[PDB]
């Protein structure tokens, strides 16, 4: 049986990492007060 | 203050799980080029 031909590599560049970590950290900073209540 | 105890674990996971996911994809991206 053939190996599956639909496989694709995934990418996340360094800028996307910076952007996404900022999003998460700032989301955490905003909602943490409400989680603690 | 009398604060929701699970707020701590919730905050840590909320930060950690999404962050770890991004790092995993970043590092394996750099190892390609």
């Amino acid at each position: 049986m053939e190996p599956n031909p639909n496989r694709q590599p995934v990418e996340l560049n360094r800028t996307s990492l910076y952007l996404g970590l900022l999003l998460i950290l700032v989301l955490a900073l905003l909602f943490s007060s409400y989680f603690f209540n | 203050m009398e604060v929701n105890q699970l707020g701590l674990i919730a905050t840590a996971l909320f930060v950690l799980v999404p962050s770890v996911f991004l790092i995993i994809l970043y590092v394996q991206t750099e190892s390609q080029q």
């Binding site: 360094r14 800028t15 910076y18 900022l22 700032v26 943490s32 | 707020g7 701590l8 930060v15």
Partner: peptide, 30 residues
């Protein structure tokens, strides 16, 4: 513990600032 959490997150953002500026993908022309 809430105080430590708030300040910890704020500290991570400041560190992130540092890397996003001085350790950015350097833009390259064409």
């Amino acid at each position: 513990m809430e105080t430590i959490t708030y300040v910890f997150i704020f500290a991570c953002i400041i560190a992130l600032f540092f890397f996003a500026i001085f350790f950015r993908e350097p833009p390259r022309i064409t």
